[PDB]
Each structure stands twice: as C-alpha cells, then as structure tokens.
Amino acid sequence: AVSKVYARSVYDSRGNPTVEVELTTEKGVFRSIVPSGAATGVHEALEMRDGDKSKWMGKGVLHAVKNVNDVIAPAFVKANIDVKDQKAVDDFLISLDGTANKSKLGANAILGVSLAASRAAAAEKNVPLYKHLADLSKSKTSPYVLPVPFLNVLNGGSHAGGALALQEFMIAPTGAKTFAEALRIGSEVYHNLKSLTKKRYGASAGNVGDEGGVAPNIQTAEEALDLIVDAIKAAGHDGKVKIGLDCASSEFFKDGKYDLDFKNPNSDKSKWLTGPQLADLYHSLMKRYPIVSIEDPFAEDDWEAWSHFFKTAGIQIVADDLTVTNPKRIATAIEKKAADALLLKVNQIGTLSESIKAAQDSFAAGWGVMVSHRSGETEDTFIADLVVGLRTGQIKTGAPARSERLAKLNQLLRIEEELGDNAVFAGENFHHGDKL
Amino acid sequence: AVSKVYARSVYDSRGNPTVEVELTTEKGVFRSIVPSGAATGVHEALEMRDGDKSKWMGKGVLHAVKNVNDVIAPAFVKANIDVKDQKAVDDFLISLDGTANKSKLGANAILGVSLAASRAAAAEKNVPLYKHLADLSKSKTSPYVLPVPFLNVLNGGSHAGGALALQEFMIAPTGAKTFAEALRIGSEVYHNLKSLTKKRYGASAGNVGDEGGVAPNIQTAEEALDLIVDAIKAAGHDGKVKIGLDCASSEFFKDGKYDLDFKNPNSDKSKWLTGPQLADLYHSLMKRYPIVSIEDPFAEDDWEAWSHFFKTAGIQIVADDLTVTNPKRIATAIEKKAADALLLKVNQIGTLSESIKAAQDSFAAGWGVMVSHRSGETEDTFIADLVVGLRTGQIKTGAPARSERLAKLNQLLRIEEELGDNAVFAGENFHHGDKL
Ligand SMILES: [Mg+2]
Ligand SMILES: [Mg+2]
Numbered sequence: 001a002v003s004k005v006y007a008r009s010v011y012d013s014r015g016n017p018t019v020e021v022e023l024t025t026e027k028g029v030f031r032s033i034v035p036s037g038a039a040t041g042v043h044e045a046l047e048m049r050d051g052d053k054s055k056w057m058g059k060g061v062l063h064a065v066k067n068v069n070d071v072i073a074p075a076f077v078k079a080n081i082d083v084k085d086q087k088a089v090d091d092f093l094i095s096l097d098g099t100a101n102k103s104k105l106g107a108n109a110i111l112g113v114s115l116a117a118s119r120a121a122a123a124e125k126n127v128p129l130y131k132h133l134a135d136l137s138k139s140k141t142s143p144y145v146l147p148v149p150f151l152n153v154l155n156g157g158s159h160a161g162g163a164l165a166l167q168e169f170m171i172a173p174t175g176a177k178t179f180a181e182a183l184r185i186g187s188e189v190y191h192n193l194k195s196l197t198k199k200r201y202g203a204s205a206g207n208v209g210d211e212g213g214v215a216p217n218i219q220t221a222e223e224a225l226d227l228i229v230d231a232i233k234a235a236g237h238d239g240k241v242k243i244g245l246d247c248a249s250s251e252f253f254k255d256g257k258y259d260l261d262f263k264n265p266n267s268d269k270s271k272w273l274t275g276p277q278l279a280d281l282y283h284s285l286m287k288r289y290p291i292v293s294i295e296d297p298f299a300e301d302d303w304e305a306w307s308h309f310f311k312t313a314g315i316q317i318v319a320d321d322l323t324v325t326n327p328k329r330i331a332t333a334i335e336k337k338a339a340d341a342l343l344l345k346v347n348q349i350g351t352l353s354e355s356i357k358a359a360q361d362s363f364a365a366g367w368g369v370m371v372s373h374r375s376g377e378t379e380d381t382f383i384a385d386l387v388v389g390l391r392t393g394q395i396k397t398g399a400p401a402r403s404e405r406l407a408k409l410n411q412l413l414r415i416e417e418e419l420g421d422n423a424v425f426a427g428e429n430f431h432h433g434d435k436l
Numbered sequence: 437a438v439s440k441v442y443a444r445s446v447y448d449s450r451g452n453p454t455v456e457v458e459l460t461t462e463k464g465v466f467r468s469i470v471p472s473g474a475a476t477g478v479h480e481a482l483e484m485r486d487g488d489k490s491k492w493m494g495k496g497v498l499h500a501v502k503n504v505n506d507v508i509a510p511a512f513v514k515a516n517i518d519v520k521d522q523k524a525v526d527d528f529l530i531s532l533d534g535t536a537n538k539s540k541l542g543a544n545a546i547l548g549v550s551l552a553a554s555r556a557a558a559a560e561k562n563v564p565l566y567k568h569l570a571d572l573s574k575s576k577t578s579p580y581v582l583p584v585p586f587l588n589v590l591n592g593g594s595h596a597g598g599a600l601a602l603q604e605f606m607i608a609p610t611g612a613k614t615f616a617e618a619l620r621i622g623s624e625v626y627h628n629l630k631s632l633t634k635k636r637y638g639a640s641a642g643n644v645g646d647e648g649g650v651a652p653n654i655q656t657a658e659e660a661l662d663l664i665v666d667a668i669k670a671a672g673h674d675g676k677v678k679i680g681l682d683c684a685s686s687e688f689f690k691d692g693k694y695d696l697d698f699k700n701p702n703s704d705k706s707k708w709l710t711g712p713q714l715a716d717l718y719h720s721l722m723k724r725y726p727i728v729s730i731e732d733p734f735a736e737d738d739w740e741a742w743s744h745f746f747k748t749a750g751i752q753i754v755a756d757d758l759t760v761t762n763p764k765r766i767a768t769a770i771e772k773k774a775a776d777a778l779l780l781k782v783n784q785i786g787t788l789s790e791s792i793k794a795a796q797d798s799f800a801a802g803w804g805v806m807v808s809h810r811s812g813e814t815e816d817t818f819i820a821d822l823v824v825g826l827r828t829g830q831i832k833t834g835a836p837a838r839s840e841r842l843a844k845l846n847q848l849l850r851i852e853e854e855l856g857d858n859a860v861f862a863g864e865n866f867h868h869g870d871k872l
C-alpha cells in the first residue's frame with residue numbers, strides 16, 4: 001500500500017529545475033525524475049513551468065511540485081491503488097487532471113507518480129523493473145532484446161554554430177554481437193571523432209553539446225557525415241557502424257518551405273526547398289552514406305511531405321514531433337502512411353500506460369519503436385529498463401559522454417549481464433527488434 | 437555478512453571505462469563506482485589501465501576488474517569481515533595489496549570495495565550514508581554542516597583552446613542561507629555566463645568542458661574573471677558569490693619555472709615566471725577580484741614556492757596534486773606551512789579509511805577540507821554524503837551542468853531536506869565548517 005507521495009525540485013543535465021517524485025510503500029521509497037526537452041513539439045503534453053522571471057530564469061517547477069504534494073498525494077494515497085495495476089494508476093492520475101493535455105496538474109507532475117508506481121510494483125513482485133514493464137506491455141516472455149544504441153555523437157542545427165541545419169548525427173553499432181560490444185565500439189568511434197574534430201576545428205569545437213556529442217562549426221551535412229565516416233574508419237569499425245539522423249525539420253519550416261540555412265539571418269529565400277526537394281536531398285545523403293534511420297525529416301504537421309517521401313524512403317523513418325508519443329496522432333500517421341517508426345518519449349504523453357499504448361499501436365501497425373531520452377536528462381535510468389521491457393531493439397539516449405547519458409547505457413550493461421543467455425542483441429534487426 | 441563481491445566495467449562521463457563494485461549482504465546489493473582524473477598527480481595511487489590499443493583506446497580496466505573478482509572477492513568473502521568496521525575492511529584490502537601505492541591490485545580495484553562496504557554498513561545500521569560516515573570519522577551532527585558548492589563554471593588551461601593558463605574558474609555562493617538557495621544562485625549565474633559567452637565569443641564557446649563549464653578562447657585570467665563578474669551581476673547576485681581557482685600549475689611548470697603560455701609552441705622562454713613572480717600575479721588577482729580560494733598555485737613538489745606564498749596569501753590555499761589525499765604528503769605540507777586546505781579525492785589514496793584520516797589530520801592542523809570529484813565522474817553520489825559526513829562545509833563537484841555533476845548536487849538537496857533543522861549551511865564559514 002502506498003503510504004506517501006512526495007515531490008521535490010531537482011536539476012537536470014542543463015542545470016534547469018525539474019520534478020522528482022518519491023512513492024513510499026512497504027517495499028521502500030521509489031524515485032522517478034522527469035526529463036525535459038527543448039523547443040518541444042507543439043502537440044506535447046504540457047510541461048508546467050512557474051514563469052517567475054526572478055527565479056531560475058523563469059523555469060521553476062514549484063507549481064508542478066506543489067500539484068503533486070497538495071493535489072495528487074492526498075488523493076492518491078486515500079484511493080489505496082494497487083501499484084501493480086499500472087492502468088488503474090494512470091487512469092486515476094488522468095482523471096484527476098481532467099484535461100486533454102494535462103494542463104491542469106501538468107505532465108511533469110503526473111509522469112513522476114506514474115513512473116515511480118511501476119518501480120514500486122516491480123519491487124512488490126520481486127522482479128527487475130524491465131520484467132515488470134514487459135508484463136505491463138504484454139511483451140514476449142523471452143528472449144529479452146538488448147537494443148542497438150543510436151549515439152548522437154555530432155550536433156548540428158540549434159545545438160551548434162555553423163550553417164549545419166540538421167540537429168542530430170548518430171552512430172548505431174548494428175554490427176556488434178552484444179550490447180556491451182556495441183557500447184565499446186560506439187565509445188571508440190566517439191573518441192576518434194573527438195580527436196579528429198579538435199585537430200581540424202580546434203579545442204573549442206572539441207567541447208560537447210547538451211547530449212554529449214561534439215559541436216564544431218560545420219557548414220554542411222556532407223561535411224558532418226564525412227567526418228563521422230572518418231571516425232568510424234579510424235576506429236577500425238567500418239562496416240559495423242550505421243548512421244541515424246534527427247533533422248528536427250520543424251525548426252526550419254517556413255511558408256511551406258524548408259530553410260536549410262535558417263541560422264543565417266540573411267538566408268537566400270530563393271534557395272529554400274519544397275517538400276519534394278528536401279526529400280531528394282535525403283536520398284542523395286542516403287545513397288552516399290550508411291544511413292539507416294531518419295527522424296522528423298519533415299515538419300510536425302506537414303503530413304503530405306512525410307507521405308510523399310515515405311513512398312520511396314527505403315529505410316526507417318522515425319516520427320517524433322509528428323506523433324509526440326500520442327496514440328491519436330500515431331493513428332493518423334499510420335493512415336497517411338507517413339512513417340514506420342515511433343520515437344517514444346514518456347514525458348511527451350505524460351503516463352506510462354499511454355506510452356506503452358503508443359508502442360503497442362506502433363508495433364501492431366508493423367512499425368518500429370525507438371525509445372528516447374530528452375535533450376534535458378537526469379540521473380534517472382527508466383528508459384533503459386523500458387527499452388528492454390518493450391523489446392524494441394533500439395534506443396536513443398545520447399552520445400557516450402555526460403552521465404545523464406551513460407547512466408542509461410551503463411544500466412543496459414547491467415541488464416544484459418543479468419539476463420545472461422536469456423537475451424539477444426538486436427543488431428542489424430533493430431527496426432523489428434520486437435519480432436526477435 | 438558479505439556473501440558476494442563483484443566488479444564490472446562501466447563508463448564514466450568522458451566515455452572511458454571505469455570500475456564498478458557491488459557488495460552483497462543480507463541488506464541487499466550495494467554499488468560504488470570509481471572516478472577518474474586526467475593528467476593525474478604523479479604521487480596519486482595507481483589507476484590501473486589495460487593498455488590494449490585494440491580496446492577502449494587502450495583505456496580498459498579489465499585488469500582492475502579481474503583483481504576484484506579473482507583476488508579480492510574470494511579472500512574478502514572468506515574473511516567474513518564486519519562492514520561496519522571500516523578500519524578492518526580497509527586494513528584487509530591494503531594488506532592484500534601489500535604495496536605503498538596499490539600498484540599490485542590497483543587503487544581502482546580496491547576503492548570500489550572500500551566504498552561499497554560503507555554503504556552496506558549504513559544499511560545494516562539503518563541510517564543514511566552521511567550519518568554512517570559522520571560516525572566513521574567521529575564528526576559532529578548536532579547540527580550537521582551543509583557545504584558551499586564550488587562550481588567550475590569557466591574552463592581554462594589544458595582544458596581550453598586559448599592562452600588561459602589557469603585550469604578551473606569556480607563560483608561559490610557563500611552568501612546563500614541554505615544549500616538550496618546556493619544551488620539556484622549558482623545555476624542562475626551559470627546560465628547568464630553561458631549566454632554572455634555565446635554572444636561575446638560565439639556559440640562554440642557555449643559548449644561545455646568535461647565538468648560542465650563553458651570553455652571560451654580567453655587569453656588572460658583577468659579577461660575570464662571579468663566575464664564571471666558580469667555574469668554574477670547580470671544574475672543579480674552581486675556580493676553573494678565569490679570565486680575559486682584551480683591553477684593546476686604543475687601543468688605549466690617547466691625547467692623550474694612557470695610558463696603561462698605553455699599552450700603556444702613558440703612560447704617566449706624569457707617570459708616564464710618564477711615562484712615569487714607567479715605569487716605576485718596571484719596577489720594582484722586577489723586584490724581586484726572576489727577570489728576566496730586558490731588551488732595548486734604551485735608545482736606538486738615545489739614546496740618552497742608554496743611556503744613563500746602562504747606567507748602573505750590572505751585566503752584559503754588548497755592542496756591537490758601536492759598532497760594527493762595522502763596523510764604522509766599532508767604532514768609535510770603541515771610542517772612546511774605550504775597551504776591550509778586539502779582537496780579530498782578518495783581515488784587519489786584508494787580507501788575510505790585513509791581519506792578519513794587525511795581529513796582528520798587536516799582539521800587537526802587547523803586546515804580546511806574541500807571534498808572533490810575528478811574530471812571523470814559517474815552517476816555515483818558518494819562524495820555528496822561524505823562531504824556532509826565530514827562536516828567540511830565545502831565541496832567541488834562540477835558546474836551545474838552534466839548529470840555526473842548534478843547527481844551529487846541533487847543528492848545534497850535531498851540530504852538538506854531530510855535533515856531539516858538538523859543541518860546548517862556553512863556559507864562564509866566554509867573554510868572552518870567543521871568548527872561550526
Ligand atoms: Mg525535439
Ligand atoms: Mg527528435
């Protein structure tokens with residue numbers, strides 16, 4: 001039985017306040033922390049901020065925290081909910097909020113309680129969190145699937161200077177035999193990339209962005225990709241490391257066109273690309289580079305552009321701001337045939353049950369599911385267990401630098417170690433990891 | 437009873453492998469992770485690395501891990517040691533190594549067991565870790581003393597691409613009344629410093645170094661210090677924030693002199709400073725800027741320079757590479773009156789007992805003690821509890837960016853919250869927090 005629900009303000013990887021929740025039962029105290037993205041999708045569940053310009057640059061979470069302590073806590077504890085029944089737990093929270101986008105209590109107030117309950121349930125059942133998550137999601141009993149980690153080793157767009165418009169350049173060691181090996185491989189590539197970057201761009205560029213990847217002033221995507229290839233080759237892993245991209249195109253969508261030079265206040269408008277033109281650009285990058293996944297290639301509501309490209313893409317197309325981990329928007333994407341992979345972010349919807357639901361609807365439509373962190377992370381490692389429990393075979397949780405990233409990757413090492421022979425590495429089959 | 441001792445490789449904040457140890461007793465599984473510095477002091481205890489160029493850039497810790505699982509674990513488990521007797525635990529580990537600098541098993545193999553045991557003991561005693569550490573060191577808890585955080589928000593030295601010779605530029609919110617206020621103030625100043633840095637130096641300057649601080653290409657310390665001051669003023673915390681420094685002078689100590697331009701290959705040898713000359717420079721920096729602490733202003737073995745400076749230096753003088761948390765080195769520093777504060781790094785010595793002894797010897801000599809992280813950290817939060825347990829009043833665990841840093845800071849927020857009226861914020865009495 002839950003005897004107490006408590007929330008407090010803590011700091012995320014960017015040094016901005018966020019909500020941390022603790023749920024107390026006879027098994028102990030279970031903690032969960034909420035992540036925070038930047039320039040979030042317009043359709044994401046509401047992240048509640050104080051707005052007090054004299055406190056935390058106006059990014060305080062006192063209101064959210066109060067909502068947990070003075071609203072959810074007393075009601076939740078009095079309801080005597082069975083934490084093992086995740087659906088009951090989240091129906092109560094959703095019903096207490098009463099709004100569609102959780103704007104009353106705030107998604108960052110609800111999620112904490114939702115996630116902490118699942119940890120309390122796992123302990124009650126005396127099983128590893130990923131096992132309980134698998135039960136909650138009706139995943140295969142075995143074999144468990146270790147995911148291929150897509151490491152954002154090079155940042156562009158809003159996460160760096162230069163003209164480079166694309167936001168994320170990831171490497172995925174699909175050629176590894178185990179997660180431990182993929183992670184080793186990934187770190188080696190990353191160190192080779194950092195040394196090359198400092199040598200060609202200087203110490204300044206050698207420094208890392210919010211997710212731990214290098215952020216040199218790159219001019220073009222081809223320049224970035226060639227650097228990634230050189231790093232892979234230098235590391236000795238050519239043929240075993242693939243590339244993933246997060247274009248975050250909504251960032252440069254203007255007048256039905258895409259400005260690949262949106263960082264230049266004097267960008268040539270005659271050079272802005274239309275949907276079909278931006279699609280051809282991706283094709284040229286795909287033909288020259290080992291790209292196996294492309295996230296948000298088009299705007300969050302530019303459905304026709306997504307559908308056109310999907311006709312000939314030929315590789316995993318991941319929807320992030322387009323779907324915002326929302327089953328209602330996922331249905332639309334499926335009907336319009338806009339993509340075939342969901343970037344799953346629990347804080348984009350607000351509850352674990354809804355997130356699991358988004359994943360099931362995706363798999364049911366033949367889609368892949370890439371579990372993801374947010375640009376603003378914490379020492380919390382929930383998504384590590386979540387990606388194993390959902391057996392997706394793929395996760396995006398940062399570069400192999402900065403511990404809000406390594407915390408998850410290290411957790412995956414412990415899970416793999418613990419699973420022993422009761423597990424397989426997604427490898428080349430990451431897209432359909434759940435079918436493994 | 438300790439039924440099992442196990443070690444595995446995990447990744448630190450820089451993407452390099454390190455040792456993680458788990459000790460199992462009737463109370464559960466207790467985990468500790470070993471930190472890792474860069475350009476470590478010549479006298480530091482041995483951090484054993486594999487040196488296999490075909491794996492982890494030659495930075496693997498398989499040898500250390502094997503020492504734990506193959507040598508320490510069996511003997512330790514059979515010895516049936518009482519984890520609450522930290523002295524006993526550490527005497528056994530040290531005896532098993534039998535070397536002065538832990539060159540046989542490695543400090544990175546021994547430290548994880550030493551730390552894990554103290555966590556297991558705390559659980560056996562049913563008290564929080566900082567409480568057990570207060571008992572182990574015989575520290576006062578009526579009331580506990582919360583530390584003032586020294587946040588390395590501006591990077592220099594070998595950690596920068598300019599001429600800035602000094603390695604670390606920290607801010608210390610000594611004017612706060614609680615740790616919580618101190619951390620918000622620190623983060624606010626940090627965010628102001630970041631934007632100011634990007635506008636004046638460029639986006640690339642906004643990128644963070646290993647410890648989360650900005651790394652702009654600055655030429656002189658004055659330039660860096662003026663920027664920090666503008667950040668403090670812009671944040672609106674004038675007079676409430678002081679500055680700290682980590683010169684890490686050993687880095688630019690060549691031919692008996694100090695080269696403040698050791699980053700330029702054509703550095704003018706006729707301009708290299710001498711012991712007394714470097715002091716004159718610090719003295720002037722102290723007169724114009726709100727500097728309250730200077731670390732490693734002189735070479736790790738250039739005692740004369742240290743002694744001469746301490747003579748007129750009217751602020752706290754921290755010893756890091758000079759003492760390497762070694763009771764023997766500290767004794768020398770005491771007798772020669774080289775400094776008046778110890779930077780306490782558990783992995784520089786190898787065991788908790790020896791670190792506790794170093795702190796005690798320091799306090800007994802009227803010295804201050806600043807608990808510190810290493811440039812290479814992990815999601816481990818031990819130092820947060822240790823600084824509270826040692827009642828030092830001051831800690832250096834990074835800038836308010838990157839979770840291997842926030843993990844400790846957030847844990848201090850939790851400890852403050854849990855203690856309530858049982859704790860007080862050291863503030864301006866940070867130097868003698870133990871006597872508070
Ligand atoms: Mg986004
Ligand atoms: Mg995205």
Ligand SMILES: [Mg+2]
Nearest residue numbers: 473475476477
């Ligand atoms: Mg050092």
Ligand SMILES: [Mg+2]
Nearest residue numbers: 682684731756
């Ligand atoms: Mg130092």
